């Protein structure tokens, strides 16, 4: 779906020993888990800020829920991530936060079993929205909670399958008894370790899927086919500056007017025209005339013949290229013609040419359609989906003119030395991770303002090079290549 949100309940185990330091002096699992939950909220409040998030502890001394079980206690409820809720959550840090947790609800009681999952089910049920993904993150260390009873074991393994019957998926993020994975136990019934993904990697992202235009392609004049013109890159930028009142801090709701024809009173758009001035004469038109004088067509894709994929250089472009797809919603049977045309253009490496008009009144623009074929593997590497790419083209007053007149060749010695330089500096480019520094600094600035952890974290400029490493990786041939042919020589 499109308006379908997704939820997450964080289930925290505090029974007997995770509240303890587990006879260690390095890292306590309770504050580790609270760090991870706070990190997830911090990432998702700027990444995907409409989803549903909640926190539940089980095994505590107190008890409060909707049906009054024993030793089950919740802290927040299913809603958007909120600054008030993370400033309530972050009180449980350190041993001082542990003792504050002890006086708030107290650790240590007879922890029950699957009725905690029943309470998670009652949190998932009563919400009047639409839900796409239902997962339960379980923060625990004990890998055998049935040391004394088989009845609670059977009810756990039955209620978990019952929650699996209506599509709920839990996945425990496993803790560590010595520091690494060593409790090799048999949860091969309940579930369907690595927590750096819950820590780090989702500081900047957004979530969507939309279509941006639904158009028709006309082959001759009378044989047309429906396509949707999706976007793939869109140059994301920072959210707008909402206006606010200084004292009371509420929205302002400004309003605009136009008046004052040396009479006071008021004016109206029917009492005014548009104009231009050329030396002496001014030309006076209307708003509808300005709107009408840019018209050439109706919105669509007119075919204009096929072309081999050699003449269009990839040096020629003007816009982020879109991606067209066929659909059997407007006209039934367009997948057949698109698959056949795709197969023929794919085997004979020929690109199509079209005239393109986006909406109800825009002057036309020449676009070129180039096909592309899909890829996947066992890891499902869907990096290429099949379909046609719409390379834009310039017309005549986009290609500018350079001075163009300088020509001196070079001696065949430096090319091998530069080949050695670039081969010493040779590595894979990337798949990702070249994040925006100014947007990232603004993200962290907005992070450390509604929490009053004052200290504004300096943004890591990942785009910067490291010349102190690259000098030694290159080697002492800088001055050699300098004094080879281009000395400074005063």
């Amino acid at each position: 779906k499109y308006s379908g949100r997704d939820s997450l309940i964080f289930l925290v185990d505090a029974s007997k020993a995770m509240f303890e330091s587990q006879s260690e002096d390095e890292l306590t699992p309770f504050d580790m888990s609270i760090q991870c939950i706070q990190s997830v909220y911090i990432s998702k409040i700027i990444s995907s800020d409409r989803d549903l998030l909640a926190v539940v502890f089980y095994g505590t001394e107190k008890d409060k829920n909707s049906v009054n079980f024993k030793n089950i206690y919740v802290l927040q409820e299913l809603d958007n991530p909120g600054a008030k809720r993370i400033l309530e959550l972050d009180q449980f840090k350190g041993q001082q936060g542990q003792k504050r947790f002890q006086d708030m609800m107290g650790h240590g009681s007879d922890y029950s079993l699957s009725e905690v999952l029943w309470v998670c089910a009652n949190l998932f049920s009563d919400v009047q929205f639409k839900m796409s993904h239902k997962r339960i993150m379980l923060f625990t260390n004990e890998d055998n909670p049935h040391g004394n009873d088989s009845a609670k074991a059977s009810r756990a393994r039955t209620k978990a399958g019952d929650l699996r019957d209506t599509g709920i998926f839990l996945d425990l993020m496993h803790l560590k008894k010595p520091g690494g994975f060593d409790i090799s136990l048999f949860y091969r019934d309940i579930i369907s370790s690595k927590l750096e993904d819950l820590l780090r990697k989702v500081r900047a992202k957004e979530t969507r899927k939309r279509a941006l235009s639904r158009l028709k392609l006309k082959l001759n004049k009378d044989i047309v086919i429906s396509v949707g013109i999706y976007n793939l890159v869109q140059k994301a930028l920072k959210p707008p500056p909402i206006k606010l009142y200084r004292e009371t801090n509420e929205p302002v709701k400004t309003k605009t007017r136009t008046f004052n024809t040396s009479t006071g009173g008021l004016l109206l758009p029917s009492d005014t025209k548009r104009s231009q001035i050329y030396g002496s004469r001014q030309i006076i038109l209307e708003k509808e005339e300005t709107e009408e004088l840019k018209r050439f067509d109706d919105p669509g894709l007119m075919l204009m013949g096929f072309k081999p994929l050699v003449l269009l250089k990839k040096h020629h472009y003007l816009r982020p290229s879109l991606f067209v797809y066929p659909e059997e919603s407007l006209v039934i049977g367009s997948s057949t013609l698109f698959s056949a045309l795709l197969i023929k253009c794919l085997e004979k490496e020929v690109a199509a040419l079209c005239r393109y008009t986006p909406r109800r009144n825009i002057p036309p623009y020449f676009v070129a359609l180039v096909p592309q074929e899909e890829e996947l593997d066992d890891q499902k590497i869907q990096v290429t989906p099949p379909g046609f790419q719409l390379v834009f083209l310039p017309f005549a007053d986009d290609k500018r003119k350079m001075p163009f007149t300088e020509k001196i060749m070079a001696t065949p010695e430096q090319v091998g030395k530069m080949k050695a330089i670039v081969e010493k500096l040779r590595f894979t480019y990337r798949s990702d991770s070249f994040e925006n520094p100014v947007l990232q600094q603004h993200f962290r600035n907005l992070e450390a303002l509604a929490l009053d952890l004052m200290e504004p974290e300096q943004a890591v400029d990942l785009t910067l090079p490291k010349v102190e490493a690259m000098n030694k990786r290159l080697g002492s041939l800088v001055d050699e290549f300098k004094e080879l042919v281009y000395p400074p020589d005063y």
Binding site: K255, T256, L266, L268, S270, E288, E291, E292, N361
Partner: protein, 359 residues
């Protein structure tokens, strides 16, 4: 039962998570609206009239305390759709309970942002300016301020989703109709604002016609034409322009379904037919063609609202053909033989030959 619903409607406000109690209060307001219309006795009705308006607890002060709330709209809308029936269940005997209804209309209109609320908030005010059209209780409503506010609400940004603009264009003509002791000066600009909008909305080869803005402007022109008339003796230019606009709006389109602008244009042309003196003697043939074609439209609010226009057109053409009945021989012979051609045509319609008998 009695007034405990009102105090608990006040009491469903101060508690946090006002959702289920909001739904119970929604059912409470539905219960009051089901109760006070069921009354077949005027004694309990005139009791409930003053019962529903205390100054501390009640629906009006509830609206006056439901102002800073996002969810509280399906109940405030229910109260506003209820008061349109509360100023119709009785007659004119809700007269002391009227200026407060006008003030809550103005507040709930100008403070809210949802179009499902500003529409009954203007139907209520139009019904309130429609009941008390007499001389009384009309400087008790500040009609000199409604013109300034609801005229300043069309010289700003485009946000109105045109169903509100239909009601605004109707209301600025109803103001010029009833109690015209105040705006005997500013109606120069109101006709310009009625005409330029209709020119833009009907004559432009871009941007396919926002439909109900036309019906709003036509009903506002119909209500404004009285008491500030421009007939063909003092300004036979704007009257010719207005007749050209209604002539465009009565041109018969073949495939049209939602009939609102024929019912607006013909019911405007019915009343003020005498305003167009010399711009009526020329297209009489084609006028009769489109009018007689619209006489057979198998509807309930088109034929019965166009027969009035045909009737007033006949009444207005005979009184002009009679005064100089010398050169109009072909006109009178053509009209009489059209009446005979109707009366000799074998048809089984009852309201298609009672327009020939009258002619």
């Amino acid at each position: 039962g009695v007034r405990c619903s009102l105090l608990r409607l006040q009491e469903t406000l101060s508690a946090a998570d006002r959702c289920g109690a909001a739904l119970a209060g929604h059912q409470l307001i539905r219960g009051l609206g089901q109760e006070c219309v069921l009354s077949s006795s005027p004694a309990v009705l005139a009791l409930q009239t003053s019962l529903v308006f205390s100054r501390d607890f009640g629906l009006l002060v509830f609206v006056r305390k439901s102002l800073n709330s996002i969810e509280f709209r399906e109940c405030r809308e229910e109260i506003l759709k209820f008061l349109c029936i509360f100023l119709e269940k009785m007659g004119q005997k809700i007269a002391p309970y009227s200026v407060e209804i006008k003030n809550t209309c103005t507040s709930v209109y100008t403070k809210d942002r949802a179009a499902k609320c500003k529409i009954p908030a203007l139907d209520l005010l139009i019904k309130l300016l429609q009941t008390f059209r007499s001389s009384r209780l009309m400087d008790e409503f500040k009609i000199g301020e409604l013109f300034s506010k609801f005229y300043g609400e069309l010289a700003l940004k485009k946000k109105i989703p045109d169903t509100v603009l239909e009601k605004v264009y109707e209301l600025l003509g109803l103001l010029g109709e009833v109690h015209p002791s105040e705006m005997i000066n500013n109606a120069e600009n109101l006709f310009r604002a009625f005409l330029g909008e209709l020119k833009t909305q009907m004559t432009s080869a871009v941007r396919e016609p926002k439909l109900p803005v036309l019906a709003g402007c036509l009903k506002g022109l119909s209500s404004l034409l009285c008491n500030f008339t421009k007939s063909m003796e003092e300004d036979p230019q704007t009257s010719r322009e207005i007749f050209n606009f209604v002539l465009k709006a009565i041109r018969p389109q073949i495939d049209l379904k939602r009939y609102a602008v024929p019912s607006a244009g013909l019911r405007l042309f019915a009343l003020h037919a005498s305003q167009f003196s010399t711009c009526l003697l020329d297209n009489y043939v084609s006028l009769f063609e489109v009018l007689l074609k619209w006489c057979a439209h198998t509807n309930v609010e088109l034929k019965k609202a166009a027969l009035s226009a045909l009737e007033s057109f006949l009444k207005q053409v005979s009184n002009m053909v009679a005064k100089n009945a010398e050169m109009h021989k072909n006109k009178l012979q053509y009209f009489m033989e059209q009446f005979y051609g109707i009366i000799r045509n074998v048809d089984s319609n009852n309201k298609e030959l009672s327009i020939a008998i009258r002619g």
